[PDB]
Amino acid sequence: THQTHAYHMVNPSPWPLTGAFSALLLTSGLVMWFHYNSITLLTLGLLTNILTMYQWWRDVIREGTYQGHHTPIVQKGLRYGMILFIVSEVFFFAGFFWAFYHSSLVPTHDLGGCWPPTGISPLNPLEVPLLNTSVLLASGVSITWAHHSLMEGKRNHMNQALLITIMLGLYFTILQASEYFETSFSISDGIYGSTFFMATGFHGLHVIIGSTFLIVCLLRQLKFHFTSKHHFGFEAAAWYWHFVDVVWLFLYVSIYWWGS
Amino acid sequence: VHSKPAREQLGVLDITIGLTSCFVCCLLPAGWVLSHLESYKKRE
């Protein structure tokens, strides 16, 4: 009753500061892992940032569903901020694709002027990338089914849909690692290997983030957090996973069908 | 923008103190380093 406006007043939280210093710890741990080969501070930084993100998102859930501070105009702000982060990462991967096409459209004299560079046979797109695309497209259509099950009000149906999607996503990650094991060449191996391993590895990190975010939204639903209208966790899940789907479609088409 | 009178007006000495202190104190680092730049250069 003290606050007339419908916006949200955030209580003082330490986790901005602790996440900032965890980013400090992560960067320094990468420095002393690349140069002075010490794993310890890198592991400490990983633990700090993972734990800080854990209870930061715990606290934002606590003010969202346990206090009802996520007023619909704040929900509009959350949707805007999520879309802005998605388009920022779209431009991040667009810079990666710019690097790939700068390597691709003008093959250098070192590579023989031919793409793919000689000495490597690229993995064929016909079987395992089709399996990848089928998994991601099935995951996307299952997420759409789950969201419309939220629209209808069918909890059992969207639980089944979410377990199906998470099974597909973890299958995609494990066979992503499997073909990483079963590819003929590495990241430190040619400009082709460098660029597609960098792009696919950043995409693998992003689909790992999406899979864990699906774990969070499913475990929130299993504790009845989501409702029929205020389900921005699953809205962000659908948005992020469709971002993953379209980025994988772009990467698949470009890398696996251009110069392969 | 009209301004209310200074609650703690600074005297000629107070103004001198702040001005002189600021100049000398801020010049101290550079001055001392510049004076001993050769000494620092010495790998010794």
Partner: protein, 94 residues
């Protein structure tokens, strides 16, 4: 039948209070632009406040780019300086 919980019995707090406000049709927490566009002396523009002192930003000509912000205090209907439309303050305590 219900399956997933529904927010009209699940959500509590500020979100619930403004859902109650939305379903009874009046907004006390400034979600929407206000009403009663009439700025005469005898019928000024009604401004709701939980206090006796509140900012109002008058766009006092149509499609005017710059806003004229000024305060309202409890009392007579203070008018916009560069146009002259009147505003009077009501306390809601909500």
């Amino acid at each position: 039948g219900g399956g997933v919980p529904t927010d009209e019995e699940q959500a509590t707090g500020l979100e619930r209070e403004i859902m109650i406000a939305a379903q009874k049709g009046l907004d006390p927490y400034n979600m929407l632009p206000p009403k009663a566009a009439s700025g005469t002396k005898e019928d000024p523009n009604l401004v709701p406040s939980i206090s006796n002192k509140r900012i109002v930003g008058c766009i006092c000509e149509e499609d005017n780019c710059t806003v004229i912000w000024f305060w309202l205090h409890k009392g007579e209907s203070q008018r916009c300086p560069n146009c002259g439309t009147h505003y009077k303050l009501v306390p809601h305590q909500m």
